[PDB]
Structure formats: structure tokens, C-alpha cells
Symmetry: C3
Subunit: 259 residues, 3 copies
């Protein structure tokens, strides 16, 4: 306001306006809430340092060029224009959009979204028959037909469908009750699937839909089935809301500026 950070701070401690709820309160209340500008120099350091978002190798080792024989997906995370360009190998695509919330863009999911069924190792195929079966079903408008009930619905209910020694989805997702069904997602019936997640904990018409008929690419189910969290092999129990993840998101929302 022409007001200094210090002044807003001193006013905020009087007010009681700052609330400390968790280990990441410094980041949450003083950095994100105050919209402090994030320098690209810090962002560069995140992609270059190991364990920057949770245990594993530095992103730039495997994604350090727009050459597809030196870097996976022709994705260059080591430069500001590279980040903005995204994957250059066909099918080429951006991994976020400057100025927009990246939480559910490709970069957001790769940092925060555990592959399903939870715990499955990255060396299991993401193009397997069951996955492609679901992809096609979603494409066909995700109908509730004979075919679905017979050939698709049991994929969520059978052990070892997407890899050896893996539990059926409905082990963890079988009701809309807060525990024991995670995210209150119920994958036992057609209706449970199209209802989506968190319908009890949030609005029933603010429920997180997991199937988007006509669109496999935007379907949380298909995304979770096909996207390995980064860096590859990162354990599921690693914090999905790492402060560096949040500082990264802030930088993107601020324009992904090379300044």
C-alpha cells in the first residue's frame, strides 16, 4: 500500500492476524500471504538440487536439455525459458501456464500426485491393457453400460491389475466416509466413480470429480494411473505440500518471471 513488509507484520502480530498451525507457518503466513516476489534464482536452485521437493535426484539431471536423447521428454528444467516451454519431444506440451495456479497442471501433479494404486513402482507400465481400457471408456463418454460393468468396473476391484503385488483400488476407496475411504472416494460402483472425491467433506457439488467424460487427459483417475510422481521412486509418504513446492507455485502464479 506503500506499506512496508515490516509494517504489515507488526500490525499482523498485534491483530492476532497471523496464526501458527503447522511446521510451515513461516512460509504460509509471511511469504505466500504477503505475495513476496519469488526470484527466479531460487527456482533455478530447486531444479538443480537433490531432495529439493522430497527425496531423490535433482530434476535437471534427467531433464536438462530440449534434446530428447539427453533429457526425458525434451524437457529443460534448468532454464527459465525451458521451464516455460515444457516438454519439447512429441507430443510437445507446456507443463504449466504463467500466471495461473499450477496445482493441477502437469508440473503440479508430477510433484504432488502419487501414482495409483498407492505405492506402485515406476517400472510398471503406464500403457498396460487395463489402463488403455479405462482410457477408452472415458473417451466413449464413460457410459454406464453392460460393457462397463463387465469389463471396466472390476479393474478397480481386482488385486494385481496394474502391477504385481498391488492391492485393488477398492481396498482404500470404497465409501464416502472420511475414514476409512481415503478422500471419501468410492470406486466400487459406477455412481461412486462419477461422484468423485471429498463430496462429504466439501460440497456435494464441489466434489472433486475423478472422471471427466470425453477427456482421459483431464481425469484424475487416468492421471493417477499413468503419472509417476517426481523424482521417480519418491516415496508416497513424502510431504505432498513441501514448502518448496509452494514457493514454486507462487513463482508460477506471479508470472514465471525470468527476473
Amino acid at each position: 500500500d506503500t506499506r512496508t513488509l515490516s509494517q504489515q507484520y507488526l500490525d499482523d502480530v498485534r491483530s492476532g492476524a497471523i496464526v501458527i498451525e503447522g511446521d510451515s507457518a513461516a512460509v504460509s503466513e509471511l511469504i505466500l500471504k504477503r505475495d513476496i516476489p519469488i526470484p527466479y534464482s531460487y527456482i533455478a536452485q530447486l531444479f538443480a538440487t537433490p531432495n529439493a521437493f522430497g527425496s531423490g535426484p535433482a530434476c535437471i539431471i534427467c531433464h536438462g536439455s530440449n534434446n530428447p536423447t539427453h533429457a526425458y521428454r525434451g524437457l529443460n528444467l534448468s532454464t527459465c525459458d525451458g521451464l516455460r516451454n515444457g516438454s519439447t519431444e512429441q507430443p510437445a506440451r507446456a507443463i504449466f501456464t504463467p500466471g495461473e495456479d499450477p496445482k493441477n497442471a502437469i508440473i503440479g501433479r508430477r510433484l504432488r500426485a502419487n501414482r495409483m494404486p498407492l505405492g506402485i513402482a515406476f517400472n510398471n507400465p503406464t500403457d498396460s491393457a487395463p489402463i488403455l481400457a479405462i482410457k477408452e471408456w472415458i473417451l466413449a463418454g464413460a457410459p454406464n453400460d453392460e460393457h462397463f460393468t463387465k469389463e471396466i468396473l472390476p479393474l478397480f476391484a481386482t488385486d494385481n491389475t496394474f502391477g504385481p503385488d498391488t492391492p485393488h483400488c477398492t481396498t482404500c476407496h470404497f465409501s464416502n466416509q472420511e475414514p476409512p475411504s481415503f478422500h471419501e472416494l468410492n470406486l466400487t460402483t459406477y455412481e461412486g466413480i462419477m461422484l468423485g472425491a471429498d463430496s462429504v467433506a466439501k460440497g456435494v457439488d464441489n466434489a472433486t470429480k475423478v472422471i471427466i467424460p470425453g477427456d482421459p487427459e483431464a481425469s484424475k483417475v487416468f492421471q493417477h494411473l499413468t503419472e509417476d510422481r517426481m523424482p521417480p521412486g519418491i516415496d508416497p509418504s513424502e510431504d505432498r505440500d513441501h514448502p518448496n513446492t509452494q514457493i514454486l507455485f507462487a513463482w508460477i502464479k506471479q508470472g514465471a518471471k525470468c527476473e
Copy 2:
């Protein structure tokens, strides 16, 4: 005098001159004792990296500019001259002096000194009424009068004085013997407060004076009451003598050179 580092090393393992007590033996005995020059590049990396002096966000996020609307206190820790300039927002002040021991300068206190009462959260006011009373009392020459006995002395003995759900000072500071009273500081009486800390182990007057009559700014009591340890929210039990802190001090003592 004229020996190489290696030569002094080989001499000292023979002498028994090198002594090992803690994980930081490498640092204390081989780096600090030999005044190995610290490169600014390393120092820069310390303020730019999360957890560099203990758990928390990187300094340069909150202190990355001399613009007080982009950086707390207009303090720029991200450049060498920025470090040398210190806080630029009024009241502007240096946080250290090149060539001088920074242990008890503002930079040293912010890294090593836990705010009191120990454990208190940073969203409590540092200018509250009790703090101003104590400050006033110190300004007036810290007399042992009626006002002190009635209005100041009990501030060290009452729960929740400096914030909600905080223990009274005399919980941990009530005698001059090493356990159970921390740093042998006794705040139950006037004489104990003016005697200070560390009176048995180094003193009784090689003791750390904690009240400097006439000068609240230099008084450890007032400092510990008003200064939050950095980064904000850092847990008190985090090492106060982190090797990176010591390396930082070394760099400052060596002239704070920009290479």
C-alpha cells in the same frame, strides 16, 4: 608461521594438538583454528538455501532487496554489499561490522539467540506493555526501587505475561547452580537479575551481564524478549552453534570480502 596447511596438519596429529569432541571437530579444529579463508560464494549459498543454519526457509526469500515492500526491514542478504549495508528501513542499522566478532551483533543474535520465554511463537508482540515496562526500567538506570519490586520483578514470575500459554521466566531461571537453573541465571530477585548468568562456571564476575543499566538495546534480557530467532519459527532445540554459523562468523571476521 611459514608452514602449509598440510604441514601443520601432520604436525598436529603427532602433537596430539587435534582433539575430537563432537561432529564439528573437523570444522572447529581444521577450519576455524587455522583461519582458512572463507569464500563469499559459500556465504551467498548459505543465505540462499533452506535449512542452512537450521530448519526453515531460505533467508533471501524474506530478505532479498533494499526495497522495504519486497523485503522485511529493507534488509538484503542476497548480495555482499547488501549484507554490509544491513537493514535499510527506518531505523536503519548494520547487522555486523567487517573484521569484528559478530557473535553478539544483530546477525549473531538472530541466528543463535532463542527468544524468551523459550519456545514462544513469533506472532507475539515484541513491543507489548510488559516489554516496554522493562525497557523503561532499564533506561532509568535499572534501580532496585518500589516500582521494580511491584511492577517489574513479577513480570519474570507470572505465566502468560509475554504471550498466551507461556511459562514464567523463573520456571527455568531461579538459582545459580547449573542444573536445574539454565545458564545459572536467577530472575527471582533484583540481585540475581543484576548478577547475571554463567556465574559459577566462568564467574562469579566473568559473568554475562544480562541487564546493562541505561541501555535496553544492549541488555540480553531485553534482546531475548524482543528478537525472534531466524528463520521465524525455528525450533529452540535446533543447534545454536551450527557449523555454518561459525563459518559465517569467520567470514565476517576476515573482512566480509566479496570474493
Copy 3:
């Protein structure tokens, strides 16, 4: 085929195998020979705990000036790395394009000083060590002098430092447990046979004594070389991913790109 293409082909083949937390590095970075950029390597020597607990390498090895850097060794620059130690006795710490596993840089990162746990403030030139060095120089014979004066050094407590166990505590047979690296130091034949004799053939065994040459002898190396950074705890991972990436870079030519 591209990296992505070799990857997707490899997951279908069953070609990728996962054994440890460090699976990503071994199978996706080392096995596909992704080029390692010097900029990353630089950051390794400049960051504390990069290869395991301890100060950043460049603090102690940050110049070719021996009053500013141990051994006049500069790890902070690419030409510095290739140069190695400049203080007499000057020597390179690796050779570009060759596996550095057993070069000086490799031993200082992976080889715990022996006997395991001995502190770095113990002399690496003590009488027992010179005795062993001399015995190796003389061709490592199995004579009277060896049996009476050398062999017992490996079976006696507090030989190489105060409160240190006899070597044969951990090295007395050729099986993975209980004898580490299948090394048997109780007999002449055991010492000359070496390590890894079961896991490799008996004629692919890793020799730990190289007669005539102490500098190249694994026994003498372990007795005299402190793992870096000084004071690093022995139980620290000897196969740190950063160590492996470093080795990859060196093998790739140690390019200043």
C-alpha cells in the same frame, strides 16, 4: 531412440530392476548414460553433506595455494579438479575417461580408514604402518619376519590406535557375513588372496596386497587414508548417489561443460 523411448521400452521388457532407494539413479541416469553437467559437479563440492555428513569440500580444498588449501588441492574449479593436488608430492586425484572408483578421489569418498572407526587424529605414519609398508616393498614374502612381526599386527588390539579392535575381528574368513568383503587377514594366504574371492572367481579376486607397491595396496591405503570429509562416520553410505554421478562425470571425460 530417445531417452523417453528407451524408458518406455525398458519398463515393458521388465528391463528396469528396483533394488534400493537409489534405483532412479542407477537405472535411469547411469545405465542410459545421461551426460552429467560440470555445473552440478561444482555444486557437489560446494555444498555441505553432498557425499555424506560434513563440511563442504571447497572450504578445505579451495585453492592451489597450500597455505589456503590442504595439499594445494582445488576442488572448486573444473581445471582444479583435473589438476589434483599441487603441493609436493603433487599428484592427480583422477584421470579423465577412466573409472575413478579406485583412484584417489574414489578412495577418499568411499574407503573408510581401517581399523573401521579409527579417528582422523591418529597418525598414518606409525611404526606398525611403516612395518607393513616395508614388508610390502620387500615383495610381501611369507618368511619368519612376516609370521613373527607382521602377521600379528592384524590380530592385535590397539595396534593402529587406542581402543581399536584387531582387524581379524571383522576379517577372518571368506564369507560375506561374518567377514566383510570376504577378506581374511588371519593368515599369509588369506592376506594375499584378498577380497571378493567368492563373489568373483578366485582369479578375479580383489588383491589387497600388491607386492613391491604399497601405494597401490588396498591394505596400506586403508591404513593411511582418512575418508572425506574428515570425521565422516563410517556407517555413512559408501554408494551415495552423488558419488556415483561424480564418477559418471569423470568417466564421461570430466568435461568443463
